[PDB]
Design a protein around this ligand. Structure first.
Ligand code: NAG
Ligand code: NAG
Ligand code: NAG
Ligand code: NAG
Ligand code: NAG
Ligand code: NAG
Ligand code: NAG
Ligand code: NAG
Ligand code: NAG
Lengths: 559, 559, 559
């Protein structure tokens, strides 16, 4: 950086060395982006959801006592049975069933019938229900509970009701079971039939499927509809049916975002798909490795309907680069569908839930493209400055080659100029101890005389930089101080720091980037999320169970 | 960039063209921020929550058998009835009720009384309960179950218990229903009365509201309290009451963050509200468009209490810019309240849950302000460099106008100097084929002679850059090589690449910004979140339902 | 910036002032990072989870009617009792129990036995269950329900079943209670014994612990196993046991990430732990303040096993800086374990759930290190440019000190050169009103004559910049226009803007950073999260409760 010029004696070039001025500067200089159509999908988390019908006969017995002043109902007992096919299907079409219910236990037969009367046919009429909840049809909305006519006696009254409920059920992959709106569980895939690989944990022979099945809504009661494939299941206390869709009904991933104009920018490791609209950028570990998906075929349709709309609605300035679409997988588990456009002449994928990554990736990807393009101009514009700083030197040498030389080099040197060529040598510094100045200057010497040694003495003349070889006021430099000379005769000697020094240095007051400790914030804490339900799962159960145990303590004493 | 100087003959200016040196450089140069008080609110997600009282008489009958060696309890049957107003209100004030229960079914009357005895008045005393759960008062904590006195006979014992439960209920907007701690559901708004637009799906006449109602805590039993408006609801197996608040009780959005010093910075599209403390920045699509909210009036109070504290606690160096506060909506669904300060003389808003956006927006907004301010200094400081690079040229021309000229231009040119003005022309290049050098230099020529053509021949002298018009050692340039001249006589000819070339070019070894593939990370996965509950909703139900179906299979044989 | 040179008369230096050229430039110049092993932990949110065994005898009575044509089952009543120790432990070892059940109510004894027969010993054999759910052993999988033999009569049949269930329970800190797979709740810590500070809300004497207890799996029935400490609890309708672990079994925080090579970089406020692999950076409010944790001792083991592997697998180029490990807490509630390596010779912590912070912190921390290192080169490289722009001036003064001087200063000045020293003065501007040029130039004057005042007149010669003291064509500058002089005689007068002006200014076409409004996006909304469960908590309850209230309305008429 900084450079000492000892008092150097330099009346010596033995054509040391020589360099030329490059007739001209040789300016050293210092990414490939294809527009395309981006479309990203994510893992889908909404469980597969479908309509289910359930059927069931409810049998209630009330024990009713006929006292002398009033009556007491002393017990009520309600049991719910399944419904056989012969009558599931009067229910599905005409909406009639029987008011009776049969079974066999150890060979003996048990039977229940409405009002302890006879087994007849009845209609299921609609009943009321929740704003927007399951819909039911029942056959006896009245409970049979009339005191026998003899005072001081118990009579037991039977009532039977056929109940159909329409509601929906949900199942999650890999489809081991499903659950109906009202809380019922079924241990099997909604997609299972005889012989399917689909999962099945129910009785082997409580399941069966009907073909060209005729279900009708209560409002097309007695209409002949199209016919469908229906599953039927017996669960002891009810029967369940639903329509038998293939497993293709359900789709693993779902469409997240679709990006009109996006630039795919290639690198070593990966490819960055930056989109300006989504203000985000998807990176994939691919290096050109375009895939084709297998068990995600569920997407083809929409994936290629949308590409068609995009393409067509921009079709004029652009042509297709790949004839087909290709597939990429994000590190965060997103799935990219992409086809690039060139100009015309002039199982699960395991999505992480961190939407921030792709936008950070975009801040930084963006501030990169912008800093780097301004750095390129620093280059060009700065290169021009050198191209002329060069020439200028070529000139300045012609004045005095030496200084100009020392300067560029960065050390005490000396040189002569031999035409189109400059010849630099090296100097050898004289005694810093013995270096002495002389008073006189006698025509006159524009430069003072001085004498010095190395072991005997010599006599010489002072150059600028402390080099050595009417009304007259001049000033001169020496080792660590200046000299005042009136009329070619010495006057006084001021120090290097006495005479004011002029700075010419354009300050580049560029200040550097701060540290900033980024604050940790959240929109919603966990408690806030927990407290966000109306159903106190814990409250409702813990008190339920507490009360329960209290009544159970009544069954006995506690010493 | 790079520039060929053919061997050009240029003893010709027909006062081609002339330019002056701008007596001085004309330096081209290259946002408005108002401090204010920021305060952001979010969508609130904690459901509206209030105290509820429920009331109910429980009737149990036990069937108790008196055997000869021991007794068996063969049935237990428990039914829960609502409570009429005449007695809801002994309960609320004195805490007494009846041990009896009446009703009419098909004109006939049924009645139950404790211990099958007489209808009297009883006290409800406090019972035990969960650490911190619902509080109850009961009237018969004992169950009546004593064998009749005759051996080998069934007797049926009635016990009745009045039960009050204090607990809380929760309701979510738009308030279609609510649910009490213990799991009970009510199909209506907690804010509904006769004639209100509030939602109501219960029986029209099971609901009613009391005015100046007197409820007292068991500990101010028999105190005359203030009186309040209370809802009363009959749900068949219980009555429910709660205090009748207006719907203003509940608030859609809640206070998130409040920011002491924040700078609002305006743009084309939007306004950026950057805060240094929150280390974040809220952007709004407004362009000055300050709003005033309508159904969020719930905020006014706190919003303007806090502004008052802020203002006052900084009131001296600052004055109010708007006299009122104004309202803004973030793209991420936050709601900004803001009033700017100037110095003194010297339905839902749909919050997204992505806390990252505003901090990314702030990283980049920040690195922008910082890069751009350092780029401004590059400007000023670099402009100074040109201001002096200018002057320097004005000088250097005076030495030899030509080179200095070619240089700035970027092509072979030639010029004379006419006082304060320079006159540039254009040259015409001679034969590159026929260009020949001469041996002699005989006073002497400081420049060698050479002859050349265009079709006949001419004879001339070599200029620097290959232009054309005692102990003597000099060196000279020619097309693609140098010439050694001893004593004004040619010696040898070395090539352009034989003699070492000196570089003067300050290297600007600025390296550009890396690519960095940002990693995809999460703090907590989904499984981790799912596994985070103690209640296995699925476990508790699926086994519940399995067991259930097992007992149901016992009702019959299975061939 | 811009500078007026009035027509200034400057034949006056009274050795005004003088400055020297710093023999050389004095170049002003403009963070400490230690590699180490990072390892971060988070708050753990998976509740403590352990195996539980429950035991219980179920007593059912069926009321079975024997009609003349068929039989009716008119009631069923099932009660569940706990199991005493004398027989809990036949169950745990041999898997036999009694088919009978006893109790005392008000001194009187009640008893139930299977099939209303005699009290014997029975085996509990395995039963079936859910794919992968709780496992049970039962003793009577058959229900006793056989019509008495007399026509038109009720008989009541008793059946008793002993049931053991193996399942698991979960408890959350601070461990106030726990819940078993099937929905049962227990009001106490799973870690409680006599005298422990652990929490206990059950009966004081229903709890007890066995020592060297012998439980065996049904498959090592009658094997003598090791023996263990077991809790036993009576809950009225069942007994529960589990193994009695210490509370150390459970750990508050869990291991999140572990980082091979990471650089810890110190600042004023904080320390930044940046890791290149995790592409993230953890900041801590510490300032060297290394902690040691207290109730997180659960980590020591793994924390220091992993440090050992890391260390050893890089042990050669690195040595340990601290002999022990030290502990830090992130602002986002992460807990850093860290030990730094130097080269060899050549309660809860409250984790926030915002994974984005540490990566933003890293984008910006990174773009800082990179911008700042390129800014350092701007410095060095730009400093060199000044170092030579300096020297060049030292030269150019020797041509004409004045202009060179005015230039560097930035105002009209004038100077002479006194050897190694330059002496600057100040000038005094003459009349802008009265400033007049003369026609002649008669040997000749290379500069025209002009006369001017201040109040009387004077006569003088024009300098460059408007200063004042055969075939001849020259051109000259004056106040706001130029002058054409043919043969030392005036010709015409063109304006400052008539003659074309040459620009030499290297354009630094650096453009500044854009604003970018960052888009607000989420991967999964709330509805999407809510809709993601199969169990409609609300559906299953609201319809449950609706139906319930419907049957309750049957108990009476409604005028
Ligand atoms: C009721 O009658 C129908 C028609 O004969 C028959 O299929 C059904 O089994 C009968 N049910 C009972 C309970 O006897
Ligand atoms: C399921 O398979 C059957 C027969 O192969 C077909 O008729 C039905 O439409 C399929 N479902 C779909 C939508 O592919
Ligand atoms: C001037 O430059 C230095 C380093 O180059 C820096 O420390 C300082 O902050 C700068 N000042 C301003 C106001 O930019
Ligand atoms: C019990 O007595 C009170 C007081 O006369 C009365 O209001 C109530 O209806 C009676 N209840 C029954 C169950 O008879
Ligand atoms: C609700 O309205 C009533 C009467 O207009 C009023 O007395 C009551 O205080 C209101 N609630 C509030 C807090 O505005
Ligand atoms: C030197 O500069 C070039 C381009 O200007 C760049 O490729 C290289 O990385 C730089 N070297 C260093 C060490 O900064
Ligand atoms: C059944 O017998 C065993 C063995 O004597 C005894 O411990 C138990 O109390 C008896 N149980 C009943 C219900 O009598
Ligand atoms: C719990 O404490 C007991 C006795 O002090 C000990 O035997 C047992 O192993 C402890 N548990 C652990 C794993 O520290
Ligand atoms: C040229 O520079 C100016 C300011 O220095 C800027 O406004 C403009 O965008 C630049 N042009 C380009 C193409 O970089």
């Amino acid at each position: 950086q900084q450079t000492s010029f000892p008092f150097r004696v330099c009346e010596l070039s033995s054509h040391g060395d020589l360099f030329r001025f490059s007739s001209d500067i040789q300016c050293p200089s210092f990414e490939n982006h294809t527009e395309g159509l981006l479309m990203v999908f994510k893992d889908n988390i909404i469980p597969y959801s479908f309509k289910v019908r359930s059927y069931t006969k409810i049998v209630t017995n009330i024990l009713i006592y006929n006292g002398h002043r009033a009556d007491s109902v002393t017990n009520r007992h309600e049991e719910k049975f399944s419904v056989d096919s012969y009558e599931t299907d009067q229910m599905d079409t005409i909406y009639q069933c029987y008011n009776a219910v049969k079974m066999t236990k150890d060979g003996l037969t048990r039977v229940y019938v409405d009002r302890d009367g006879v087994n007849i046919t009845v209609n299921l009429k609609p009943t009321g229900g929740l704003a927007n909840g399951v819909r039911r049809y029942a056959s006896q909305t009245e409970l049979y509970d009339a005191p026998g006519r003899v005072e001081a006696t118990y009579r037991t009254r039977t009532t039977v009701n056929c109940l159909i409920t329409d509601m929906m059920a949900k199942s999650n992959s890999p489809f081991d079971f499903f659950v109906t709106t009202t809380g019922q569980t079924v241990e099997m895939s909604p997609f299972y039939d005889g012989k399917n690989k689909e999962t099945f944990h129910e009785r082997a022979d409580s399941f069966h499927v009907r073909t060209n099945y005729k279900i009708v809504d209560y409002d097309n009661r007695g209409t002949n509809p199209q016919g469908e494939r229906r599953a039927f299941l017996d669960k002891g206390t009810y029967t369940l049916s639903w329509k038998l869709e293939n497993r293709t009904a359900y789709c693993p991933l779902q469409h997240w975002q679709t990006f009109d104009s996006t630039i795919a920018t290639e690198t070593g490791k990966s490819i960055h798909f930056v989109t300006d609209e989504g203000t985000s950028s998807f990176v994939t570990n691919t290096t050109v490795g375009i895939e084709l998906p297998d068990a995600f075929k569920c997407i083809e349709e929409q994936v290629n309907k949308t590409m068609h709309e995009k393409y067509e609605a921009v079709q004029d300035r652009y042509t297709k680069g790949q004839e087909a679409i290709t597939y990429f997988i994000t590190s965060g588990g997103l799935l990219l569908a992409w086809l690039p456009l060139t100009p015309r002449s002039l199982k699960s994928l395991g999505t992480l839930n961190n939407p921030a990554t792709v936008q950070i990736q975009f801040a930084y990807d963006s501030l990169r493209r912008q800093i780097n393009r301004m750095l390129g101009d620093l280059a060009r514009a700065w290169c021009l400055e050198q191209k002329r700083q060069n020439m200028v030197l070529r000139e300045l040498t012609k004045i005095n080659p030496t200084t100009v030389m020392s300067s560029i080099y960065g050390k005490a040197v000396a040189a002569k100029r031999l035409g189109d060529v400059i010849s630099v040598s090296q100097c050898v510094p004289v005694n810093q101890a013995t270096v002495t100045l002389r008073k006189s200057m006698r025509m006159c010497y524009s430069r003072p005389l001085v004498s010095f040694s190395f072991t005997k003495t010599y006599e010489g003349q002072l150059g600028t930089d402390n080099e050595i070889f009417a009304t007259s006021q001049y000033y001169f430099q020496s080792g660590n101080e200046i000299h005042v000379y009136n009329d070619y005769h010495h006057f006084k000697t001021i120090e290097l720091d006495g005479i004011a020094t002029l700075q010419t240095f354009i300050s580049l007051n560029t200040s550097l980037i701060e540290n900033i400790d980024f604050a940790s914030l959240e929109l919603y804490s966990r408690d806030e999320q927990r407290a966000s339900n109306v159903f106190d799962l814990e409250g409702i159960f813990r008190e339920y169970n507490f009360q329960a145990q209290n009544i159970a303590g009544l069954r006995k004493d506690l010493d």
